[PDB]
Amino acid sequence: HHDGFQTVKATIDWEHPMFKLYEKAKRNGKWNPADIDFSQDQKDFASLTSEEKISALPLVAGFSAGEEAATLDILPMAHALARQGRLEDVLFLTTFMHDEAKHVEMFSRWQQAVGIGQMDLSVFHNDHYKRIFYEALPEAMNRLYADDSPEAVIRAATVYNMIVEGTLAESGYYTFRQIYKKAGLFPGLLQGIDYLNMDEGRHIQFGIYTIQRIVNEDERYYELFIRYMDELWPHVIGYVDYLTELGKRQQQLARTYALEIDYDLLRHYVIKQFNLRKKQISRT
Amino acid sequence: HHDGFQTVKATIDWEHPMFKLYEKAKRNGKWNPADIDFSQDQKDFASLTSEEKISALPLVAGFSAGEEAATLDILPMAHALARQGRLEDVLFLTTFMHDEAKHVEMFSRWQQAVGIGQMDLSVFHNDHYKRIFYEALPEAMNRLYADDSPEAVIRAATVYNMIVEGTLAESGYYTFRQIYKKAGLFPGLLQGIDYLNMDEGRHIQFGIYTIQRIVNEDERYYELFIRYMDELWPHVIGYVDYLTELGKIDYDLLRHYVIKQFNLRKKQISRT
Ligand SMILES: CCCCCCCCCCCCCCCC(=O)O
Ligand SMILES: CCCCCCCCCCCCCCCC(=O)O
Ligand SMILES: [Fe+2]
Ligand SMILES: [Fe+2]
Ligand SMILES: [Fe+2]
Ligand SMILES: [Fe+2]
Ligand SMILES: [Mn+2]
Numbered sequence A: 001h002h003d004g005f006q007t008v009k010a011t012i013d014w015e016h017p018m019f020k021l022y023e024k025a026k027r028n029g030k031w032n033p034a035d036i037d038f039s040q041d042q043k044d045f046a047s048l049t050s051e052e053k054i055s056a057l058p059l060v061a062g063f064s065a066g067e068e069a070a071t072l073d074i075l076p077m078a079h080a081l082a083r084q085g086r087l088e089d090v091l092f093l094t095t096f097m098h099d100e101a102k103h104v105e106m107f108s109r110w111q112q113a114v115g116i117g118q119m120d121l122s123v124f125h126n127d128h129y130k131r132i133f134y135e136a137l138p139e140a141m142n143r144l145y146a147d148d149s150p151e152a153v154i155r156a157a158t159v160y161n162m163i164v165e166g167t168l169a170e171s172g173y174y175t176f177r178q179i180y181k182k183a184g185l186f187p188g189l190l191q192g193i194d195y196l197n198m199d200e201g202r203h204i205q206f207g208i209y210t211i212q213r214i215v216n217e218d219e220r221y222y223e224l225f226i227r228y229m230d231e232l233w234p235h236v237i238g239y240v241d242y243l244t245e246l247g248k249r250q251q252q253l254a255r256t257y258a259l260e261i262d263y264d265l266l267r268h269y270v271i272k273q274f275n276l277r278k279k280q281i282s283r284t
Numbered sequence B: 001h002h003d004g005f006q007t008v009k010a011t012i013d014w015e016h017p018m019f020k021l022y023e024k025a026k027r028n029g030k031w032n033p034a035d036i037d038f039s040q041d042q043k044d045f046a047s048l049t050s051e052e053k054i055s056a057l058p059l060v061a062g063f064s065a066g067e068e069a070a071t072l073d074i075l076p077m078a079h080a081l082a083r084q085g086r087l088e089d090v091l092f093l094t095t096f097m098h099d100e101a102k103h104v105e106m107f108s109r110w111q112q113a114v115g116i117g118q119m120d121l122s123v124f125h126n127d128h129y130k131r132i133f134y135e136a137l138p139e140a141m142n143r144l145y146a147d148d149s150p151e152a153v154i155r156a157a158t159v160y161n162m163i164v165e166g167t168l169a170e171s172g173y174y175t176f177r178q179i180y181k182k183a184g185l186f187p188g189l190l191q192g193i194d195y196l197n198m199d200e201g202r203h204i205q206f207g208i209y210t211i212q213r214i215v216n217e218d219e220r221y222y223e224l225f226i227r228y229m230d231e232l233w234p235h236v237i238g239y240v241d242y243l244t245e246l247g248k249i250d251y252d253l254l255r256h257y258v259i260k261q262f263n264l265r266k267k268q269i270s271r272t
């Protein structure tokens, strides 16, 4: 039952940080995946050798499943904050969810356009990937339906916003630019990634706001955050190692396009992102 | 756990009706309540007598609470269809939810601008209004977390889309235009109502799609739909009666518009 309604008893809290982020989301999140021209991506992909064609698919496989999970799995956080009466957070999260729908859509449109929609890309999800995206993420989010304690909310935000978005997704944007933008390939995909990277800046800010406000109540939760970050790292790097090992086995795309793909620089960027995210939460 | 992912094994079902509605929602649903200029609404409201001022508040109180409930209470429907693997429905519902967020925002910005944001408007929710929006609506939606049976989904869409949106909300837009558009009052609010009414056409389409696809499996669900509609009618008309009595502009014309919408919504679902 509803006890009453905030915008009947009072108004929206116009100065709330999540209302301000909601306003930025509406202003800055206008792109439509349906407007991206993928006709050159189709030609690029068809001109690749079958072995150059493979080079790109593990990353796309990781993002398609990642964004699809993100779309489904943010719903429990919106429910939990709604139940807590956090109306401005909920408003913001409608833009978060609609962003993720556009991200799932964008990657699926690319796969359709380049002619791999019919290919099952699950083969590029190794055990570490599955531990994060098939298991740990939905588990942490679904918990919130029955347990919205500070510990549960910190864990959900850590897995979703700080690891999946703030570490893996961020490193995936960078990787995509380091390879395909340098090669001059897949302009529509890169246009999509750029829009998506802009959206995700807000998503990470929501995760920081959420973790920090809970840490602010009791510094003890800061140790929980660091611990949960560290619990997931073995699967973060276990998946990065797998993609790295795949990239190192099929190198014709790098050879062909004179790319010196520095996977050790990429691996270093993942480590950088992970420690950067930790640093954006403070004990006090 | 996730078993797999549709956009990894295959793609979005591009021809799905809810994917098509999602595409339409992106193309058509671009407005921003923050762009509406409410400066003349403030002057219009200050120009009213105290008695005229209060006459305007019950309808706004009903909408502000209604849109806030809608924002919160669509989440279980999104969850239940997500759990059923109905990805295109879920994509569409992200536009549904962000629409309701704009609707809540719009009416709250209007209250702030005209100077009643500090006034507790709960006094204009009578028992019938509370039965629907404080109780029946969240009850039917939340049920879906533990019971996503056809009967539960039909009931949820009936209360939310066919009664709250298709009957009360539709009749409220009409009412605002019959009274204030004709009076030349609150142009910012009426601009908002117009955008909101465009959005809500899609929301009603989702409810029709959802109810009819379940009805298509079994005509016993058609009778359930009609029963749930009739079960809520006394509170619908109990609230309309309350608003009409406060108003005392053809109220019998408005009251008949409500009945018209109610019967219209029933006729948009077919037994067959
Ligand atoms: C060799 C370096 C590898 C770099 C890591 C590649 C990461 C692939 C990204 C897939 C998951 C991203 C999903 C984000 C969803 C969301 O917005 O929450
Ligand atoms: C005098 C005739 C009265 C006509 C009916 C007035 C009803 C007031 C509006 C309140 C309901 C708002 C519902 C929100 C709709 C949504 O789910 O998006
Ligand atoms: Fe995100
Ligand atoms: Fe391993
Ligand atoms: Fe609606
Ligand atoms: Fe009554
Ligand atoms: Mn995303």
Ligand SMILES: [Mn+2]
Pocket (backbone or CB within 6 Å): B067, B070, B099, B100, B103, B196, B200
């Ligand atoms: Mn609405």
